[PDB]
Design a protein around this ligand. Structure first.
Ligand SMILES: C[C@H]1O[C@@H](O)[C@H](O)[C@@H](O)[C@H]1O
Ligand code: NA
Length: 443
């Protein structure tokens, strides 16, 4: 009921992050990141792996370009590693680092692949974490200095930039739940980190506008989880609102000029961050787009005896599941309709969508990942519905181009549209990747 075609100028890409794919962790002046420290801490990664080699994309990005070209994509979302650019976090530049990314940008543009660059995809320089990391306002200031450096050199060629990827993860997984680097476990520290991440975003936007050699299209990338109460009871509805506030509105509202949501301030009490009119104005620095990373919904039941927020997930077993998630494509439509009608950000990009499976190389040599094909098919159908409703959607990036180091899950959780043999570093396009190729060409 939503037609057949996407816009002719739609952006079609795949996405990666530097620590997940690059390897070469000590090469060419790179400094230590929090993810180097964390992955080298016994027990923090499920399978004893690290990003030391990963996909070896520091050396093999040309192979990655070959895959993007084989897929007929027109864009590549990737991150720049702050440790390669400013190894001390705050300090001199490492021109060799910048020059690596300059050559990669030129290779992408030569191939007809628009670079969509993420400045911060979780790889904070360890020296900054030694000075409290996102627990310090200074980290926000020097993040903006890094953003300036990078834009000054690459902004003649790269128009589309994101400051941060998934600040909820960096703050809440990294400083509250301890599952991500740097691995702290305190709610107040997580909420403080969340504020300094938003402040760093806003300071960076302003620094990038001043350093820009041409006008830029600057955004931020948020994970969003559409949340639904398991019943209409006051208790379940309130649990859904608390979860929705914890993940989504805590970030969307300040970005939208609305301040932090008061219901969440009330809930968090004394753990809430120190945070004034001046910082809010900074946080709301005008953006040219918003990136949405969408994977799943949350169907919330009140659970008065759990950690902040007392919201238990109610699984639907009749819905399919992947290796690690429930599949719910209609949530993509729902979150986009909400953003379109309720929030000011536009245009919108889906900067990540994808799934993990127990992928293996079959006897014939292919990877028969039909559930991942079906995942893309169903989510793209929802995007057509969103477009029909007027949502100002301008592109879609599959997470991920290739299997990679999936954070606390290690190399063991495969999200690629291309398979990565981590021993030999060979990549092979999965059946879902060929489906994407053919879908994109058919448009
Ligand atoms: C599965 C995918 O999840 C998102 O949370 C991230 O931005 C990306 O690095 C990867 O973890
Ligand atoms: Na399954």
């Amino acid at each position: 009921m939503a037609g057949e075609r996407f816009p002719a100028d739609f952006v079609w890409g795949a996405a990666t992050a530097a620590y997940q794919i690059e390897g070469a962790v000590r090469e060419d002046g790179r400094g230590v990141s929090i993810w180097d420290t964390f992955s080298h801490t016994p027990g923090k990664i499920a399978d004893g792996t690290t990003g030391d080699v990963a996909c070896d994309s520091y050396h093999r990005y040309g192979e990655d370009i070959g895959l993007l070209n084989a897929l007929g994509m027109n864009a590549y979302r990737f991150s720049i590693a702050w440790p390669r650019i400013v190894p001390l976090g705050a300090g001199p530049i490492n021109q060799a680092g910048l020059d690596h990314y300059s050559r990669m940008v030129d290779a992408l543009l030569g191939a007809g692949l628009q670079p969509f660059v993420t400045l911060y995809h979780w790889d904070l320089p360890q020296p900054l974490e030694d000075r409290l990391g996102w627990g310090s306002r200074a980290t926000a200031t020097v993040f903006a200095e890094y953003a300036d450096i990078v834009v000054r050199q690459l902004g003649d060629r790269v128009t589309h930039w994101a400051t941060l990827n998934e600040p909820w993860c960096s703050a809440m997984l990294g400083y509250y739940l301890g599952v991500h680097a740097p691995g702290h476990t305190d709610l107040k520290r997580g909420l403080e980190a969340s504020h300094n991440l938003l402040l760093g975003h806003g300071l960076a936007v302003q620094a990038m506008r001043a350093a820009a050699p041409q006008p830029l299209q600057i955004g931020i990338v948020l994970n969003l989880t559409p949340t639904y109460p398991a019943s209409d009871s006051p208790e379940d509805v309130a649990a859904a609102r608390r979860f929705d506030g914890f993940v989504n509105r805590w970030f969307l509202d300040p970005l939208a000029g609305r301040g932090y949501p008061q219901d969440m301030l009330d809930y968090y009490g004394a753990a809430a961050p120190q945070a004034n009119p001046e910082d809010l104005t900074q946080i709301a620095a005008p953006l040219d787009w918003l990136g949405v990373n969408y994977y799943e919904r949350m169907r919330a039941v009140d659970a008065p005896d759990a950690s902040l927020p007392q919201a238990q997930r109610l699984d639907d077993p009749d819905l399919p599941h992947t290796a690690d998630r429930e599949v719910y494509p209609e949530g993509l439509y729902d979150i986009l309709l909400r953003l379109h009608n309720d929030y000011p950000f536009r245009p919108l990009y889906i900067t990540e969508n994808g799934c993990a499976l127990h992928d293996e190389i079959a006897e014939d040599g292919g990877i028969h990942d039909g559930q991942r094909q079906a995942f893309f098919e169903a989510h793209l159908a929802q995007l057509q519905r969103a477009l029909a409703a007027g949502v100002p959607l301008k592109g879609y990036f599959a997470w991920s181009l290739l299997d990679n180091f999936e954070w606390a899950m290690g190399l063991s959780m495969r999200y690629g549209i291309c398979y990565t043999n981590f021993e030999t570093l060979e990549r092979r396009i999965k059946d879902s990747g060929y489906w994407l190729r053919d879908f994109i060409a058919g448009q």
